[PDB]
């Protein structure tokens, strides 16, 4: 019964609650069920240390909390991130749910420099989103 994971995190403004956190053998990672304030339900890869009960939000006004998803430009330098988007509104294509969360190193103009766990460094457009936390 392989579940549907939300790698888009586009329910901006609408608060959600970590309903549960379970393992997904098809993803060799944990996933969480999120119940949103509007009735919608969605699964997400559960960052490290995310617990049942905590709130989740996405978008420019989101709080900088593990599990929250925001455009790279709205994220504090030094924060660890995963499920990094390469193209605004195309969902995350980098660190989706396996590996090691990258890290914001600097913000320049319309770019956000990020160092992948491989020491690799990339300057992604701030418009691209990423989830706070360790995968």
């Amino acid at each position: 019964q392989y579940r549907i994971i939300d790698f888009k995190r586009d329910k901006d403004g609408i608060p959600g609650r970590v309903a549960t956190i379970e393992y997904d053998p098809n993803r060799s990672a944990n996933i969480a069920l999120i119940n949103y304030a509007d009735g919608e339900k969605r699964y997400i890869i559960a960052p490290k240390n995310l617990k049942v009960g905590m709130e989740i939000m996405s978008g420019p006004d989101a709080d900088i909390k593990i599990g929250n998803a925001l455009p790279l430009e709205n994220i504090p330098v030094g924060t660890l991130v995963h499920n990094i988007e390469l193209k605004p509104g195309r969902g995350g294509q980098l660190v989706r749910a396996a590996g090691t969360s990258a890290q914001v190193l600097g913000k320049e103009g319309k770019y956000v420099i990020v160092r992948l766990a491989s020491g690799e460094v990339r300057m992604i457009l701030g418009k691209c989103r990423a989830t706070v936390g360790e995968v």
Binding site: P60, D61, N74, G109
Partner: protein, 149 residues
């Protein structure tokens, strides 16, 4: 043969680059690729008219940018915003907000592309933003970011 160049000149010589081209060749190549046209006394006067209107327009525009620059320099846009950390904002005030508050409060509809903001305003206070109303007309827009909530 005199000819009215429609295209291939300094970009588009369609303004009215009237040059005497070799007859035949003209009507065999230029006239063929729509590059030039017969310098008939009708399509010559008809050209004059377009150049005359293009010249009037360019002047209206300049005159408008100039009056518009006067209206702007008397205003003060007021954008309230959530701040905390020593006046520091939670988000950033950019060209679209500024453009919007300008329309909403002053009745001016300006393209945000003209608001020459560099780095997005991320702090409470006053900021003089340049506005490029025209190639040779820039005005100073005073923007005022106030703490809300």
């Amino acid at each position: 043969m005199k000819v009215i160049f429609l295209k291939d000149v300094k970009g588009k010589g369609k303004k009215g680059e009237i040059k005497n081209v070799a007859d035949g060749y003209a009507n065999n190549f230029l006239f063929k690729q729509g590059l030039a046209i017969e310098a008939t006394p009708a399509n010559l006067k008809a050209l004059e008219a377009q150049k005359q209107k293009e010249q009037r327009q360019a002047a209206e525009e300049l005159a408008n940018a100039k009056k518009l620059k006067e209206q702007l320099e008397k205003l003060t846009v007021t954008i309230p915003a959530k701040a905390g950390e020593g006046g520091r904002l939670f988000g950033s005030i950019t060209s679209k907000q500024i453009a919007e508050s300008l329309q909403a409060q002053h009745g001016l509809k300006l393209d945000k592309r003209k608001i020459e903001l560099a780095d997005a305003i991320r702090a409470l206070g006053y900021t003089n933003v340049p506005v490029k109303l025209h190639p040779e007309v820039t005005a100073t827009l005073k923007v005022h970011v106030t703490e809300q909530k």
